[PDB]
RNA sequence: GUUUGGAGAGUUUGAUCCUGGCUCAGGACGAACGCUGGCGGCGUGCUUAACACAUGCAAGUCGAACGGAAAGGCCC
């Protein structure tokens, strides 16, 4: 099951000697809610065809979000095309505290608890791009440990190790219930 | 050491991105005004003229400091 959010529909227009030739653009976000998300921008003469092209471009651009539990690993600031988004991890229960465009990215990413603030341009297209830039700056503790050559207990905070442990237990629980 | 904690929307253009102001959704009050109005608990009430003030109260008490004797009391 893929969750699909249409963030914005924009009616654009070319000009010609005969008048204005209108077109539609759709910014579409597709994800599985398991830490995969893709962003697709589709444009066509009609709204449904624009959305459909957006869905396809999003699936072409699936990428993986490092998620410790139901939260991002560490605070990050992504900047793209004047868009600036700050992401901060939150404790369980906080919920998605995010603005409209960033909410669509993070919900489809399956982030359940996050604090997100937009600090630059309010243009939905560029806010989405900035949010993706931030999510690409997220690092896994496993990857930090390897890149540093140190063990995991040496590079990460004990409380993040703990939250890792419990999240692995719930993954095992779902595997037990699902294979039973 | 460390989680207990940040949401945005509209509006410059034929269309676009940016910059940038304006406006709105929240909360608060020693409040006022309009419509409406059942009860109780607990608070609270001149923000203006340190303007002017009828009337009654808001500082007395001690006979174990003292001479005394108007009111009571008791004794002729
Ligand atoms: Mg701005
Ligand atoms: Mg006064």
Name the β-bridge partners of A77: A86
Q: And the tokens for A66?
A: 């490092």
**Experimental determination approach used:** cryo-EM
Q: Taking a C-beta distance cutoff of 8 angstroms, is the pair A39, A21 a contact?
A: no
Question: What distance in Å separates the CA atoms of residue A163 and residue A143, rounded to the nearest whole number?
Answer: 17
Protein CA A171 to sugar C1' B59 (Å):
83
Q: Taking a C-beta distance cutoff of 8 angstroms, is the pair A145, A160 a contact?
A: no
| Widest Cα–Cα separation across chain A | 69
Resolution in A: 2.0
Looking at residue A149, the DSSP 8-state letter turns out to be T
Centre of ligand 2 to C-alpha A35, Å, is 64
Q: Where are the alpha helices (DSSP H) in A4-97?
A: 47-60
Centre of ligand 1 to C-alpha A94, Å, is 28
């Amino acid at each position: 099951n893929y969750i699909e959010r249409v963030v914005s529909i924009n009616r654009v227009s070319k000009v010609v000697k005969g008048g204005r030739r209108f077109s539609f653009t759709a910014l579409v976000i597709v994800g599985d809610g398991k830490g995969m998300v893709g962003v697709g921008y589709g444009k066509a003469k009609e709204v449904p065809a624009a959305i459909a092209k957006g869905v396809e471009e999003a699936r072409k651009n699936f990428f993986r979000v490092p998620l410790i539990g139901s939260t991002i690993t560490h605070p990050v600031q992504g900047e793209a095309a004047a868009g600036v988004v700050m992401l901060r991890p939150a404790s369980p229960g906080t919920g998605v505290i995010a603005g409209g465009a960033a909410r669509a990215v993070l919900e489809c990413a399956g982030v359940h608890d996050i604090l997100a603030k937009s600090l630059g341009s309010d243009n939905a297209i560029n806010v989405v791009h900035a949010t993706v830039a931030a999510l690409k700056l997220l690092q896994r503790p496993e990857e930090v440990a390897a890149r540093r050559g140190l063990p995991i207990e040496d590079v990460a905070p004990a409380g993040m190790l703990k939250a890792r442990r419990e999240s692995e237990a719930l993954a095992a629980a779902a595997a037990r219930e699902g294979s039973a």
